[PDB]
């Protein structure tokens, strides 16, 4: 494909090198397509990167819905989502390029637009879990939105900053966190 085969070459690049580290010159060569091409449906570079973040967020959200069936109660869904977070191939892998990207493009009032666009799509799973858990009487959370943002970010932090200790240790610290957290909601 075209725009679709570029979005891949980019993803690979942003993940492998970082937001700046990778350039359009690079993208184009390996993607194999005149630069101008990129300019059509991919206005700027933020547009391309912001693009990938959306697809990646969506791919992940989709994977989770197709896997959350294995968790009967919302309590389990909390535990599970946080566990899978550590192993997916989606979105989380380029959380580091997001750190760059923000610091490097953080002074454009276009900053909080698509950038908050994601916030909402990223804390969604938690909103459902807690909301539904509230209905489902698994706990009573007066401020679902606050708790979802906290959980989302706390978890993202655990997945992103412990990227060296052996995988199974991670799975366990994560489960201890999920435990302490939910325990604090009651």
SS3 label, residue 164 = coil
Question: Which residue from 12, 24, 28, 59 is in contact with ligand RHQ, where contact means CB under 6 A?
Answer: 59
If contact means CB under 5 to 8 A according to the sort of partner, which of ligand RHQ, its own copies, none does residue 50 touch?
none
Maximum pairwise Cα distance, the chain: 58
If contact means CB under 5 to 8 A according to the sort of partner, which of ligand RHQ, its own copies, none does residue 59 touch?
ligand RHQ
By beta carbon distance, the residue nearest ligand RHQ is: 122
Regarding 153 and contact with ligand RHQ (CB under 6 A), the answer is no
Regarding 135 and contact with its own copies (CB under 8 A), the answer is no
- The stretch among 8-16, 25-33, 35-43, 154-162 that binds ligand RHQ (CB under 6 A) is 154-162
If contact means CB under 5 to 8 A according to the sort of partner, which of its own copies, ligand RHQ, none does residue 53 touch?
ligand RHQ
| CA gap 36, 75 in Å, rounded | 49
Look at the block and give the residue holding tokens 């899978």: 84
R_g of the chain computed on alpha carbons: 18
Cβ atoms of residues 122 and 101 within 8 Å: no
| CA gap 74, 68 in Å, rounded | 9
Q: How far apart are the first and last CA of the chain?
A: 51
Residues that bind its own copies (CB under 8 A): 18, 21, 95-100, 102-104, 106, 111-112, 115-116, 119, 143, 146-147, 149-150, 152-164, 172-173, 176-177, 179-185
């Amino acid at each position: 494909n075209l725009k679709d085969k570029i979005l891949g070459v980019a993803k690979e690049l942003f993940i492998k090198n970082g937001y700046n580290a990778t350039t359009t010159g690079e993208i184009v060569k390996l993607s194999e397509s005149s630069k101008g091409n990129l300019y059509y449906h991919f206005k700027t570079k933020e547009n391309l990167f912001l693009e990938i973040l959306n697809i990646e967020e969506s791919k992940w959200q989709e994977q989770w819905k197709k896997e959350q069936i294995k968790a009967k109660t919302n309590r389990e869904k909390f535990y599970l989502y946080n566990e899978l977070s550590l192993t997916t191939e989606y979105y989380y892998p380029l959380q580091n390029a997001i750190i760059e990207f923000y610091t490097e493009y953080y002074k454009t009032n276009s900053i909080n637009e698509k950038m908050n666009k994601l916030e909402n799509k990223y804390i969604d799973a938690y909103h459902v879990i807690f909301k539904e858990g509230n209905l489902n009487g698994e706990w009573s959370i007066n401020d679902v939105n606050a708790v979802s943002k906290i959980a989302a970010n706390a978890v993202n932090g655990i997945v992103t900053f412990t990227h060296e200790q052996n995988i199974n240790e991670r799975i366990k610290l994560m489960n201890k966190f999920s435990q302490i957290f939910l325990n604090g909601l009651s």
